[PDB]
Write an enzyme that holds these catalytic residues in place. Structure first.
Site, short mmCIF file in Angstrom:
data_model
loop_
_atom_site.label_atom_id
_atom_site.label_comp_id
_atom_site.label_asym_id
_atom_site.label_seq_id
_atom_site.Cartn_x
_atom_site.Cartn_y
_atom_site.Cartn_z
N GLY A 111 0.80 -1.22 0.00
CA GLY A 111 0.00 0.00 0.00
C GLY A 111 0.83 1.28 0.00
O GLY A 111 2.02 1.28 0.42
N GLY A 161 1.23 7.79 4.65
CA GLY A 161 2.49 7.38 4.00
C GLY A 161 2.40 6.06 3.24
O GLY A 161 1.31 5.54 2.98
N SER A 162 3.57 5.50 2.90
CA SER A 162 3.64 4.15 2.34
C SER A 162 3.97 3.07 3.37
O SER A 162 4.73 3.30 4.32
CB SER A 162 4.64 4.06 1.18
OG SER A 162 5.93 4.50 1.56
N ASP A 215 -8.33 3.97 11.73
CA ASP A 215 -8.50 5.39 11.33
C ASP A 215 -8.24 5.65 9.84
O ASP A 215 -8.60 6.71 9.36
CB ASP A 215 -7.53 6.27 12.15
CG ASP A 215 -6.10 6.30 11.55
OD1 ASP A 215 -5.94 6.79 10.38
OD2 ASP A 215 -5.14 5.84 12.24
#
Ligand SMILES: NC(=O)c1c(OCc2c(F)cc(Br)cc2F)nsc1NC(=O)NCCCCN1CCCC1
Ligand SMILES: CCCCCCCCO[C@@H]1O[C@H](CO)[C@@H](O)[C@H](O)[C@H]1O
Length: 334
Positions: free
Chosen positions: A28, A30-31, A162
């Protein structure tokens, strides 16, 4: 003391991770890399924050994410296994990595648009509320609860995250920018989610914002008298006036052959008037979850500072504060 670190290239950027974390693999942006925490045995998600201290608002966001995650200590809520930085001083701090349990599926990947049994819905919804009770006891409103924010493992164990049209589970007041939300916005969301698990179908599949609102009014009916008195804005008041009467539908016919306890709980969650929606603590005590309910293992949080993140400060102060949270971090009790 400080563990040894190793470096490897990943996602157009150099990741400098502790030793204990292995086989990182991008999963996926951030990263995020998936990884195996050899120290503890667990599969983990390791998040490198993209540009955390770019602006006042990014730095503010970083610090607030870290602080919320570090506060979240509950079986049904995502929580922090680790936070780290390579930096050996503040002067040289810019990189933040978060670590939590690798989760393989969310509530689309369980739902597969197939209807679940009553006992399974009971269990899943129970856990959401257990998790919500605790978030809410911290005076935290989630605001955007939805299947893709609901992580679940193979054994049906659930965690609220979240982080599908992302508006279908929104409280109607959020979509009308009402701006003084109750905790029961999340309860609305749970209601839509619960309805969906029982039926196999999105309950309010709006194609756009106003259609969404339109589908809701079909189900619950139009604002009754006591709700209509509460409209601050005249014109809404006045538009809502200019509608006609239409009475709530009988959920019993909307939810054909569902456990009537489930229907009855659906009726307490999907009330237009947020002040009249069942709370999480109350909903856990509902006879629908008799098989799961336990009032001595449904724990509240320590209270949590909402204003302490809504400061106006300089990037260097956010960064110094985030630094302190990274240093003070003590891993959870395993
Ligand atoms: N939690 C995870 O496993 C995860 C993840 O966590 C980010 C993340 C952190 F890295 C660190 C903190 Br602290 C919080 C946080 F949210 N980013 S992707 C992912 N899992 C994944 O891509 N599994 C395979 C694809 C299935 C779809 N899944 C369903 C649930 C998540 C997406
Ligand atoms: C178009 C009319 C449908 C929307 C009705 C939404 C009513 C939501 O409920 C309202 O939520 C507010 C908190 O945000 C509370 O302060 C109000 O007291 C409550 O009535």
């Amino acid at each position: 003391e400080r563990p040894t670190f190793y470096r490897q290239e990943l996602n157009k950027t150099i990741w400098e991770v502790p030793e204990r974390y292995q086989n990182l693999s991008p999963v996926g942006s951030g990263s995020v890399c998936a990884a195996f925490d050899t120290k503890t045995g667990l599969r983990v998600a390791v998040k490198k924050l993209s540009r955390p201290f770019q602006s006042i608002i990014h730095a503010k966001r970083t610090y607030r994410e870290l602080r919320l995650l570090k506060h979240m200590k509950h079986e049904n809520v995502i929580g922090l296994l680790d936070v780290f930085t390579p930096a050996r001083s503040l002067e040289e701090f810019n990189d933040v990595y978060l670590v939590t349990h690798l989760m393989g599926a969310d509530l689309n990947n369980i739902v597969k648009s197939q209807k679940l049994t009553d006992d399974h819905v009971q269990f899943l919804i129970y856990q959401i509320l257990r998790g919500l009770k605790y978030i809410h006891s911290a005076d935290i409103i989630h605001r955007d609860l939805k299947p893709s924010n609901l992580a679940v493992n193979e054994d049906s164990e659930l965690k609220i995250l979240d982080f599908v049209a992302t508006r279908w589970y929104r409280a109607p007041e959020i979509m009308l920018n009402w701006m003084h939300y109750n905790q029961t916005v999340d309860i609305w969301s749970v209601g839509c989610i619960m309805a969906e698990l029982l039926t196999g179908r999105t309950l309010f599949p709006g194609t756009d914002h106003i259609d969404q609102l339109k589908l809701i009014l079909r189900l619950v009916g139009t604002p009754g008298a006591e709700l209509l008195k509460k409209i601050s804005s005249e014109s809404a008041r006045n538009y809502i006036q200019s509608l006609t009467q239409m009475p709530k539908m009988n959920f019993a016919n909307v939810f054909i052959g569902a456990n009537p306890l489930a229907v009855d709980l659906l009726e307490k969650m999907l009330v237009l008037d947020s002040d009249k929606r069942i709370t999480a603590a109350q909903a856990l005590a509902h006879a629908y979850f008799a098989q799961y309910h336990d009032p001595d293992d449904e724990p509240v949080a320590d209270p949590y500072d909402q204003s302490l993140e809504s400061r106006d400060l300089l990037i260097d102060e956010w960064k110094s504060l985030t630094y302190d949270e990274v240093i003070s971090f003590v891993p959870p009790p395993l």
